[PDB]
Amino acid sequence: TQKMDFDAIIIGAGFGGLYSLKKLRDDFNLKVRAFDRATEVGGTWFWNQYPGALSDSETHLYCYSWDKELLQEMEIKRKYISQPDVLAYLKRVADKHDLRKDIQFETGIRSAYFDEENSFWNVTTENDEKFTARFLITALGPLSSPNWPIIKGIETFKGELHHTSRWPKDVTFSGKRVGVIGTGSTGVQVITAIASQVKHLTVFQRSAQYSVPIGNVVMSETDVAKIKENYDQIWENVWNSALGYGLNESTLPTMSVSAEERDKIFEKAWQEGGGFRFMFETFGDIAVDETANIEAQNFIKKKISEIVKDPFVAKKLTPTDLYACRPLCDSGYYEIFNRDNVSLEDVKANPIVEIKEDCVVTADGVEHKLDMLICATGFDAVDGSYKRIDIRGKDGISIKDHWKDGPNSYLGMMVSNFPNMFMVFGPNGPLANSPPIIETQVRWIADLIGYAEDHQINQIEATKDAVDNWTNTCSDIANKTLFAKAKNTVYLYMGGLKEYRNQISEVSNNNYKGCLLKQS
Ligand SMILES: Cc1cc2nc3c(=O)[nH]c(=O)nc-3n(C[C@H](O)[C@H](O)[C@H](O)COP(=O)(O)OP(=O)(O)OC[C@H]3O[C@@H](n4cnc5c(N)ncnc54)[C@H](O)[C@@H]3O)c2cc1C
Ligand SMILES: NC(=O)C1=CN([C@@H]2O[C@H](COP(=O)(O)OP(=O)(O)OC[C@H]3O[C@@H](n4cnc5c(N)ncnc54)[C@H](O)[C@@H]3O)[C@@H](O)[C@H]2O)C=CC1
């Protein structure tokens, strides 16, 4: 009966898809084919090429760890790695391991239907090409379709209108009046990078957020060669940590030291740089205790009032949140608002009501004349990338229907009613550095598929109770955190990378409890 085109089909050629291809094809000798709409590997690092695109984690850790030779060969130019260098790195990964011969570029996957009779997947591209594979590996990433601001007359603007997710080449800023909507991580990076290049910059800020310096500096040859000399212990620290950012994750309570010592600890992380460092290397209860969280707020607020000299602009930049989850990272964001060519518009108190052929109009009637409008307004949720595909498992239920109230899964990798489908960097996963999470899930999925090939089972599916057990574990951990109060279905597992690896290890050791292994 079953002919089958491949043993596994992968959707995505980013960090998750490239390692899924390497592990399944070369270490388990399976017949694999990967698909991506992009013309080249990279994932978000191919799509997102906006000004100032920079990694949150340091260069020596935002990479693969499974190729020891690649680690020694790796270019560590600056403390953090820019978008063109991440793209070049992932291209080198594809070059060394001969990955492109099994990737079909310029090809979008329209639908994936599970055949309960033969226990494989019917995958159809957007160009009506049909492939069959026993297993479906979905490496879609954490971000979905670009989120545009719903503003009356947005289609009327005659100037340049760019979304940061679709940043075109050859964009020039000199002599232009530019506006930026959005002050998230992407907006902060764009604003800091282009303020000195434009004639005038207007920042349309709906919600001011906390941001700490990133401290991106050049890495000397002694800085680099010494990292590669201790790379084995560095990665052992990652697997033994909660975030995988190479931090000395603190257990010290914030209010257990004096105000003078508390200031020294915050200042030390402020000088070194890093958003996760300021939160989790300083003290161990910043995300848990309200009094601790407020202390971290007041340090950044004090830094804002000192950097921007106009106290009324500093007031507009100061977040009104009672509690603060994650701060952003910047390379001179607050210094930008001291410039003569930068205007900050509080769009919560003075909302945008309309934009015309040459301007953005706020509620006060002021027409902000612009030659270019940049929308750094974010994306849809992680489950959007899945609901954007026509995925149907048992009985024909679509992932649109099964996740109509939000995403749920088992260990962040398996979905009930969708057998032989394994998610890489999917929802309900851990909150940590992405490459360590991706590597952890790809190795776990590959070991289960190899365990399947030897024990002659052809269908793997997580039970409904195992998924609901995972939702309880995530909610039990998250409700101990202030992350629930500030900005049912639980989107993230918050136990850390080490405890997440403990969770999935107990499953693989206990004969994959919660999963249903059908023999043939
Ligand atoms: C500028 C920037 C900096 C970041 N820095 C960090 C950091 O320091 N630390 C960290 O942990 N995380 C960071 N992230 C987030 C995260 O690490 C990245 O998204 C990471 O590359 C994960 O990639 P991925 O391979 O899981 O998915 P992606 O890189 O998003 O790859 C998804 C791919 O799947 C393809 N695809 C989706 N649907 C279909 C379909 N139906 N058919 C065909 N193809 C499809 C898409 O074309 C896309 O290329 C950052 C993100 C950005 C944008
Ligand atoms: N350095 C890094 O590691 C990076 C990380 N990321 C991640 O990717 C995700 C995407 O983040 P971003 O692209 O920054 O988007 P975001 O969702 O973080 O920010 C969107 C911004 O646009 C504003 N906005 C949205 N709709 C609006 C409207 N109608 N009117 C006015 N303002 C509006 C919001 O106030 C918000 O500040 C983030 O969660 C982030 O963690 C993204 C880029 C870089």
**Which domains are assigned to the chain?**
6-41+99-145+381-519 (3.50.50.60), 179-375 (no CATH)
Q: How far apart are CA 240 and CA 42, in angstroms?
A: 28
Q: How far away, in angstroms, is 130 Cα from ligand 2 center?
A: 36
Q: How far away, in angstroms, is 84 Cα from ligand 1 center?
A: 14
Q: How far apart are CA 33 and CA 104, in angstroms?
A: 7
Which is it for strands 54-58 and 80-82: parallel, antiparallel or unpaired? Answer: antiparallel
Q: Which of 254, 257, 235, 260 is closest to 245 using CA atoms? A: 235
Residues 6 or more apart in contact with residue 262 via CB below 8 angstroms: 254, 295
Q: How far away, in angstroms, is 379 Cα from ligand 2 center?
A: 7
Residues 6 or more apart in contact with residue 98 via CB below 8 angstroms: none
Q: How far away, in angstroms, is 207 Cα from ligand 2 center?
A: 10
* Residue 68 CB neighbour total at 10 angstroms: 12
Q: Which of 338, 258, 331, 266 is closest to 302 using CA atoms? A: 266
Q: How far apart are CA 25 and CA 6, in angstroms?
A: 11
Instruction: Look at the alpha carbons of 209, 213, 216, 222 in this order and tell me if their dihedral is positive or negative.
Output: negative
Nominal resolution in Å?
A: 2.0
In three-state form (DSSP H/G/I as H, E/B as E, the rest C), the secondary structure along 419-449 is: CCEEECCCCCEECCCHHHHHHHHHHHHHHHH
H or E segment and range at residue 353 = strand 352-355
Question: Atom 16 of ligand 2 has which residue's CA nearest to it?
Answer: 378
Decide: 497 and 241 in contact? Cβ < 8 Å: yes
Torsion angle, alpha carbons of 248, 213, 479, 411, to 10: -70
Decide: 139 and 425 in contact? Cβ < 8 Å: yes
Decide: 321 and 312 in contact? Cβ < 8 Å: no
Q: Which residues pair with 200 in a beta bridge?
A: 177
- For residue 57, give the ligand 2 atom closest to its CA: 3
Which is it for strands 120-125 and 109-115: parallel, antiparallel or unpaired? Answer: antiparallel
Ligand 1 within 6 A of 114 CB?
Answer: no
Q: How far apart are CA 132 and CA 326, in angstroms?
A: 42
Residue 100 burial (10 A CB sphere; 0-12, 13-18, 19+): middle
Ligand 1 within 6 A of 108 CB?
Answer: yes
Q: How far apart are CA 107 and CA 453, in angstroms?
A: 29
Q: How far apart are CA 74 and CA 222, in angstroms?
A: 14
Q: Which residues pair with 203 in a beta bridge?
A: 180, 344
Mutate to test the pocket of ligand 1, among 64, 111, 138, 140 (most ligand atoms within 8 A of CB): 140
Taking CA atoms, 85 is separated from 90, 304, 379, in Å, by 9, 31, 23
Decide: 277 and 214 in contact? Cβ < 8 Å: no
Instruction: Look at the alpha carbons of 216, 222, 224, 230 in this order and tell me if their dihedral is positive or negative.
Output: negative
Phi, psi of 79 (to 5 degrees): -60, -35
Ligand 2 binding residues, C-beta < 6 A: 54, 56, 143, 149-150, 181-187, 204, 206-207, 347, 376-379
Instruction: Look at the alpha carbons of 396, 400, 404, 406 in this order and tell me if their dihedral is positive or negative.
Output: positive
Q: How far apart are CA 459 and CA 476, in angstroms?
A: 31
Residue 481 burial (10 A CB sphere; 0-12, 13-18, 19+): middle
Ligand 1 within 6 A of 295 CB?
Answer: no
Q: How far away, in angstroms, is 47 Cα from ligand 1 center?
A: 9
Question: Atom 29 of ligand 1 has which residue's CA nearest to it?
Answer: 43
**What value, to the nearest 5°, has the Cα angle with vertex 87 and ends 84 and 92?**
125
